[model samples]
Target: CLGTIGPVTPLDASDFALDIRMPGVTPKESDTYFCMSMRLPVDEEAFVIDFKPRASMDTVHHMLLFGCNMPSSTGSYWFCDEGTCTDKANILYAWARNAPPTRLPKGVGFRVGGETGSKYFVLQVHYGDISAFRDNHKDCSGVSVHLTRVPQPLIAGMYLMMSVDTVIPPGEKVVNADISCQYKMYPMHVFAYRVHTHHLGKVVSGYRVRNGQWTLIGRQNPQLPQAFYPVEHPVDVTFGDILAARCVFTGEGRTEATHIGGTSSDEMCNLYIMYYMEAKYALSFMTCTKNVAPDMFRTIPAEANIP
Candidate 1:
């Protein structure tokens, strides 16, 4: 059986694919930092970076996994640009020992690695700029975490706080964060959606939290493989479910003003709750067929809506 482990692909399976070299990414002088924390055996892996606002540009980030077995144990780090570095020891130590999720002081971001024996991980990206990405600057307003920085054995569940300042003009882009996690379970869900962005994002979606209720389950992006959440009928949510949102393309190549709850391109806030499972109504149809039927089922107006 083909496994999800990082490198050991069966030799027979290798012949099915071909290799091609694509054009390189133009490093912009505009400061942008895309960072992540994940678990992989010290080795080489090719990963892709997509430009969220503009599609013309993309970047490639490489990971060099290294460690000596037995004597030491599994631990690794990442180097980005000249000054960016990540060490997983602290995150792993705290997680393996079942410690509380490290809550960094304001302006600081934590990095998280994968669990021991399990090749899965969850990284928190503190929303900010390049300087914050390099080292934890204890001056920013919100919290940030790096998946790569956290050590193994910590649970995959993570809390992310996202914010966007409206002072910046539209089209003027920012690299908010990067996350890397294993693709094992299908239908992964994100909960507690909250939106904080400048006047540019017209539509922000993913999962969202129901109002007055702490439950996290809703839908925003069906296309994103990592985003999935269970939804049930009679569920009521409010405007606080938005967390992270990408800037909308106004086509004029200029920043647009966004507003919250209104149709302006200036102020905004929304929340999300997320998960995945079979449809909630699927069982309703099964129950109705066993109990009601024929002309009576048709006459029952509510039954007509059953999927």
Candidate 2:
């Protein structure tokens, strides 16, 4: 179903589609992450309800759609990485290995455009090797974000937990990259979680902790489609609550260590919490990442950070 938008009618399934795609750019380097963006034509403020990723498995490694409060720049394209949204980098959807469409829970959607503060939709595509994209070839790969003008009672958003500082020790079978943070915003009802990593990823798990006690939110194999899988046992997190995530990797065969990065040679460890707040504006973004990089936030607990 698609929502049809008119001046007076409420949002249906397909009210508007924010098509975030690369501008047929040619690649000179392998393992390159390219980004392109566009502003949401202010008048069409919306609540995102679904994601339809369109790409092939050969040229595109993975694709990420982000709603940014401030985009990287006004340019048509740029060299980017695992992130694009500098101010408020809210991940709307992710795709890899032919991952299908994602639909939010009934009556719940992410607030975007107009008064919501997120104006730009940034599309980042990962290319493992550009050998095939050579010979004057250009590539265009991205996702179509489905939005609705309907007023949803529950406002949805994503909370990311990740680590880039961790190095997967060479020849190790079990390497756990952990991250934790204290929730400082409005209360959230976690409905689903999406785990992301490279080939080394084994299992990614997340939890909610309070007073030294941990409550499991979700656990899944990262090699899956990378969709937001429902939390078998859902939970609510509030102010002062400790949010933690652990990404388990096996660097058994490699002779060298690999730290988190955007390419296939490098690695990644991420856990995305898809949550909703009742009748409130969704938070642009929230994350607890252990990265030496200056752009993002990092911190939290020791004992509470266990995998």
Candidate 3:
């Protein structure tokens, strides 16, 4: 029983396939970010069953797929810093080195395109400084997504828990940056977690707090080839339950403080929680961040213009 990546073979008849690729650009320098978008051809909704990336780890740093309600700022490749592509976009999937293909649970899938209000999708590929590469080096990194005509009874969703106010003092051996949010929406069952951080990260942990009790969801050290791991014991989160994540860091190698930013030199603390909720007539995407305000339970709507 291979996990999601191994269950369905790539030869299965996919309802449709969408590929987003780079226009053959060589990395001139390090820590550079590029974005490209594509519009769905169909006006009907479908469920994503499988996804595979077509890229090399040598040139591609990370890739993220987003579902957008409207077109992005540029038609072709554009510079998108801090991971902000569009205000109408919601994260669908993300990948980095050593990450594997994703296959949704049986009878469960993510709603996309068509009448689902996600007619536009964008792919952002971050190309780290590759000045060390020899001449004639080029990249054609992208992702191939497979969809099905049969819709699922429940809709898959993702919520990002981030900490933007983290400040790690220089020379500290261990520092913990924490953030939390209350799940006020309908009951959700979390299945997987994708933790992210920069070079300075040591350990990333997530938990569920309710009625003054704490339950660990998952934890991992953000090293090379980070990937999403399924929750061994899935937890059902409902109203009044607080979802929180803490990123631990070490400043032994650096002599200066590190804050949150998009660039590689800067730091980031983010935890992607993938869950499933009862399907509704309208698509739903929501986020809550500790950086926005003091209230930890506040819901940050997708339409809000936040950096």
Candidate 4:
């Protein structure tokens, strides 16, 4: 006959083999569909799939594991078809975003939750294109299994920022500048630093001003990658050695012509540094030192003050 079969076995077939038949009639592709309902045991580990002998099938492309009332995260978990088993593992072909559901006549069952739940679970398998079974020698089989849980520890936060500039203009220059902030100090043990700039920036560097003199602490290399650059020196930045960042851009590029700012293009300057400083000091000490330090240090004559 050119037609397909329908409901040819038990409503629920527990066996993972092909040659067996259930109480109802088995349905073929031209029939309604292989739609069935199942109830899995919480203690049971895996469920198997079996294909009947001489039954036609197709290639499966997608399977959806939905959480009707389940309380767990939802995402596609990839399972690789590897090695040999007691019978044979069904090849569940799938795409990048979807897994292919295999078409076996009578040898498959669904395995449910890692634990017991109040609501029922649904398993829907979709076969991409219909193609009859080719091999008649071996019995295909596969099972869905559960996993055990293990506890883990929490981790501390680690924040790092780096930038670089290589090009500098011809005539414009960056005069002596001051960069520092008043931050609460911590006894952090490690400090690393590096520098970068665009083609127009002449000089870029960082320093620590100690006892009124500028102490060169770190410098960046234009050739090194921002992520892997090495630090020049390590020092204990106590409450006194105020951190200062100074850069000199002499040449035409220092003018506003080559200046660029925003999320779009890259300009001429960069600094890559990693350190274990206290959070309080890093945040409150230098909130706006780059623009506010010079104005704060300006001198007011006694005569001007009196007038």
Instruction: Give the Å error, residue 220, model 4.
Output: 2.8
> Which candidate achieves the best lDDT against the true structure?
2
lDDT of 1 by residue, 1-307 (tens): 1124422222232111111111111223334322223433322221111001111112211111111112121223111332122222111111101112222222221121123222322221222223323333222111111222222221222222222232334554432211111122223233222222333333333222223222323323211222212344423323233222222222234545332332334343322222122222111000000111112222222211221
Cα RMSD (Å) per model?
Answer: 18.6, 6.5, 7.8, 22.5
Please give, for residues 1-307, the per-residue lDDT of candidate 4 as tens digits. 1115422232333322211111132223421212122233333433323222222134333232221233122222111111111221111111112212223222222222344321222223333343333433221111232211111111011111222222334454543233454324554322444444545444455554456555555554333332222344555555654455544444553344444332213353434333344323332111222322445323312221111
Q: Which residue pairs clash in candidate 3?
A: 29-129, 30-129, 31-129, 43-114, 44-114
Question: Residue-wise lDDT of candidate 2 within 1-307, one digit each (tens)?
Answer: 1124311222345486656667778887767878888777645667777777767667777787888878876678988853476676788777767555456788888888777547888888878777866486666677777778777788888888889688998889788787777888888988877888888888887778777667888777888778666776668899987777778788888989999876777889888898888866456567788532222113333332234
Kindly provide the TM-score of model 2 when superposed on the true structure, using C-alpha atoms: 0.72
Ranking by lDDT: 2, 3, 4, 1
Our model 3 lands, by Cα RMSD against the true structure, at 7.8
How accurate locally is residue 217 in candidate 2, as Cα lDDT from 0 to 100? 86
Of 1 and 3, the candidate ranking higher by TM-score: 3
The C-alpha stretches of model 3 lying farther than 4 A from their native spots are 1-14, 30-32, 57-61, 70-75, 82-84, 114-116, 126-138, 251-256, 281-283, 291-307
- Weakest 10 consecutive residues, lDDT, candidate 3? 298-307
Question: lDDT for each of the candidates?
Answer: 0.24, 0.74, 0.70, 0.32
Q: How accurate is candidate 1 locally (lDDT)?
A: 0.24
| Model 4 segments more than 4 A misplaced | 1-170, 173-178, 221-224, 251-256, 263-268, 277-307
